[PDB]
Amino acid sequence: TIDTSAQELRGCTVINGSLIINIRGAAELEANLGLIEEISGYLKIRRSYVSLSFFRKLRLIRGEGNYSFYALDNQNLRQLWDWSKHNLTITQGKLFFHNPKLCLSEIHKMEEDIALKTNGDQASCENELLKFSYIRTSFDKILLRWEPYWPPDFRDLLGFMLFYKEAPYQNVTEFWTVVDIDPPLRSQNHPGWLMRGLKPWTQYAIFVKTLVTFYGAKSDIIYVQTDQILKELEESSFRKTFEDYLHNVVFVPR
Amino acid sequence: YPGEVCPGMDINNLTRLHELENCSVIEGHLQILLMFKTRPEDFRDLSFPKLIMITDYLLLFRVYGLESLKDLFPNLTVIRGSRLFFNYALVIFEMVHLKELGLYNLMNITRGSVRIEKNNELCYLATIDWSRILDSVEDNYIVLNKDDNEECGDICPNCPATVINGQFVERCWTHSHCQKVCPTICKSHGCTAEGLCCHSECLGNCSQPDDPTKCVACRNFYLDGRCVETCPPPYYHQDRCVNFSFCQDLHHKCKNSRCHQYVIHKCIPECPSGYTMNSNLLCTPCLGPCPKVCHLLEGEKTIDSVTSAQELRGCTVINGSLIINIRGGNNLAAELEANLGLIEEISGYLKIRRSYALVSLSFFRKLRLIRGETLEIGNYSFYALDNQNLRQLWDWSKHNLTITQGKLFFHYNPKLCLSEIHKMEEVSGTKGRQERNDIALKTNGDQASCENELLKFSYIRTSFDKILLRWEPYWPPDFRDLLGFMLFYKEAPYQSWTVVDIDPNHPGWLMRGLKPWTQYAIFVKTLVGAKSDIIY
Amino acid sequence: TLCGAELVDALQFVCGDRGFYFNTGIVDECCFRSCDLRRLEMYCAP
Amino acid sequence: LCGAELVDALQFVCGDRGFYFCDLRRLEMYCAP
């Protein structure tokens, strides 16, 4: 329960008390709340105004209306534990999820009384992917390219978001230096981006995602080695509606 | 007004253009578009100086071969704008190989706005002062042009510059002509060649000062080549007025065949509510409640602009849906009230889609009750999908509304709190019908602050080292639902947003950090909300 | 699925020189769904 | 991309295409094939 309380524990492996933590607004809490392996009690998730990365391993939860996994309303909970190496062995307890930005994948991969409509109201997780092509590296800058993804409505896509951050080890999570790239023109030159000066002989993790209105696709994380949006969305929707109205008025069927 | 009156035609080729070489005033809307197999070499041969007045608007869309509007409408001065094209009076969409706007004779616009989009060859709007022509300024939509995409030349032809944002910026229409400058005294009657003010009855430029009979546009009414505020009673009012003979001829030309029957009230094509027509032509008083029923084609009808609700004035009962979906930052709080002001009975569900500019619904003054004969899926009579900016719904203090049909939908309303929904349900009486409604208690009220409580505040004298202050811990009226208090303190500016949570005798709060002759703003909010006062 | 300005452009491929008619919508039938040449044929003037 | 680094910024865009005479859309065609 911090806004300190969990700092006095630090080096603890067995927890005999309930969790009523209410931290709200990851790196700062990793130093202290990053050495938890066994929990014997009640776990509750309060308001968290990014990801539940505090429990690095969480090998075993003892547990003991008999609820052990409670999640309340959140304002910044977009993701969850990495479901590639982390393992959960919760035996005694139930499941209860409130988490509006929690995508459907985190719920479907759980198998590795809960409301369905309320959970994941705005699931901003992409299903498709864009494989990287034409990868060229230099001593100072790296140029990348990707295949163009065109939705049925070409005006829906507002551009591209590019993510990049230094990562000496091959373990990067989406949880920055995001750069916006304007959408290309329909024709067929493949979209691409050239970066600025970077540290030589440093591993870099790069992945690109697309932004669309009320769809889209995101590219997988790739590793390389060297040697106010609401107003814009409203304006785009207004322009699209005006164009549709003009097309309907001008074009009349027989 | 030398010339006839064009009834209004829509323009493939240039053959259908000779109708514009004779008439001087077009009684409708001029639309020149879909001109593909044209070349600029064969375009510089036709001129229409007679066209000075446009009744509704001017629309241009993909006119190949067009270079400038100087040889098209040299004398275009004023536009009445009685009927708009998507709340606009001058639309230029997908212009092709245009260089500059040739409408140097334009002085003022009565109604509507100007939108220019997709102009990859024209960039001259930076040196145009769009302030003395149309009153509306934020309603303009000037994007996707060559001005912000390329640094093209902006040369100018002696006229004084205009300051609206910065230093002296020259204003011009084309390369050989510039914007006309009128004195501040000539507010709306225009200025002559010498700049002297004339009579306040002629729109645009006036040939001679104090000469209402010598002008090319009439501000209020035109009659016998003269500008008058109101024509004599023998002459009856399309906003000019004509005699009874013209109205009789128009009426006779509608009963024979084909309709917009013309009556006398003025010569509006529809009598107002509460009146009936009989075989003189004046709108005689009606006996017994007779509503002005306005049937809606196809059933459900969507409203997205001013022109969408334009054909709804005076309607009492609507046989269809009234879904409202208006996008953009243009707040149409005046046009909607003028149009949707006489609506009293609605025979269908009321739907409110995503509307950023719909800050409030304070325009259905005469709305008594809403029927549900034509319902939708889910048995919903009042549907609300997303209201990003809606701080108010209705003034239930003086307005009474009742609902006698199925449930209502209210979701995704960050700016609307639960108090307004509860008041609406209590007034409509739906909660008294024992029905399962649809109100969200999470997505509604999160971004809204409706305290509906006036707590006291006992302030104790502070100190230089630290500020000590206590507040009354108002207990909840039902059990103990209090979760604590939130306190904000940023600064006390002239007449971020860190918060501190205190668990629930006055608890009080202590803060550190004081400066000489400085003021701090302290206020608290309860959670179940409450507020006492804003101080500095 | 054709939307935007290119949607008009395909019309120039269809009519060619026949022009356009003088006197729901085209977007809801061609942009929001799938339409063929037969569906939009009559949109040009005879 | 102002003044001096234009040459070696363009050199790694279109490859062997040297030149044709402050994203890539203004860089791919700014060289001679």
From Swiss-Prot, chain B:
<feature type="disulfide bond">
    <location>
        <begin position="218"/>
        <end position="227"/>
    </location>
</feature>
<feature type="disulfide bond">
    <location>
        <begin position="156"/>
        <end position="172"/>
    </location>
</feature>
<feature type="modified residue" description="Phosphoserine">
    <location>
        <position position="362"/>
    </location>
</feature>
<feature type="disulfide bond">
    <location>
        <begin position="271"/>
        <end position="283"/>
    </location>
</feature>
<feature type="glycosylation site" description="N-linked (GlcNAc...) asparagine">
    <location>
        <position position="13"/>
    </location>
</feature>
<feature type="disulfide bond">
    <location>
        <begin position="186"/>
        <end position="197"/>
    </location>
</feature>
<feature type="disulfide bond">
    <location>
        <begin position="202"/>
        <end position="215"/>
    </location>
</feature>
<feature type="modified residue" description="Phosphoserine">
    <location>
        <position position="355"/>
    </location>
</feature>
<feature type="glycosylation site" description="N-linked (GlcNAc...) asparagine">
    <location>
        <position position="243"/>
    </location>
</feature>
<feature type="disulfide bond">
    <location>
        <begin position="417"/>
        <end position="450"/>
    </location>
</feature>
<feature type="disulfide bond">
    <location>
        <begin position="198"/>
        <end position="206"/>
    </location>
</feature>
<feature type="glycosylation site" description="N-linked (GlcNAc...) asparagine">
    <location>
        <position position="278"/>
    </location>
</feature>
<feature type="glycosylation site" description="N-linked (GlcNAc...) asparagine">
    <location>
        <position position="319"/>
    </location>
</feature>
<feature type="disulfide bond">
    <location>
        <begin position="159"/>
        <end position="178"/>
    </location>
</feature>
<feature type="glycosylation site" description="N-linked (GlcNAc...) asparagine">
    <location>
        <position position="205"/>
    </location>
</feature>
<feature type="glycosylation site" description="N-linked (GlcNAc...) asparagine">
    <location>
        <position position="22"/>
    </location>
</feature>
<feature type="disulfide bond">
    <location>
        <begin position="294"/>
        <end position="315"/>
    </location>
</feature>
<feature type="glycosylation site" description="N-linked (GlcNAc...) asparagine">
    <location>
        <position position="75"/>
    </location>
</feature>
<feature type="glycosylation site" description="N-linked (GlcNAc...) asparagine">
    <location>
        <position position="400"/>
    </location>
</feature>
<feature type="disulfide bond">
    <location>
        <begin position="254"/>
        <end position="259"/>
    </location>
</feature>
<feature type="glycosylation site" description="N-linked (GlcNAc...) asparagine">
    <location>
        <position position="379"/>
    </location>
</feature>
<feature type="disulfide bond">
    <location>
        <begin position="6"/>
        <end position="23"/>
    </location>
</feature>
UniProtKB/Swiss-Prot annotation, chain D:
<comment type="subunit">
    <text>Forms a ternary complex with IGFR1 and ITGAV:ITGB3. Forms a ternary complex with IGFR1 and ITGA6:ITGB4. Interacts with SH2D3C isoform 2. Forms a ternary complex with IGFBP3 and ALS.</text>
</comment>
<feature type="disulfide bond">
    <location>
        <begin position="14"/>
        <end position="31"/>
    </location>
</feature>
<feature type="disulfide bond">
    <location>
        <begin position="2"/>
        <end position="22"/>
    </location>
</feature>
<comment type="function">
    <text>The insulin-like growth factors, isolated from plasma, are structurally and functionally related to insulin but have a much higher growth-promoting activity. May be a physiological regulator of [1-14C]-2-deoxy-D-glucose (2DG) transport and glycogen synthesis in osteoblasts. Stimulates glucose transport in bone-derived osteoblastic (PyMS) cells and is effective at much lower concentrations than insulin, not only regarding glycogen and DNA synthesis but also with regard to enhancing glucose uptake. May play a role in synapse maturation.</text>
</comment>
<protein>
    <recommendedName>
        <fullName>Insulin-like growth factor 1</fullName>
    </recommendedName>
</protein>
<comment type="similarity">
    <text>Belongs to the insulin family.</text>
</comment>
<feature type="region of interest" description="B">
    <location>
        <begin position="1"/>
        <end position="21"/>
    </location>
</feature>
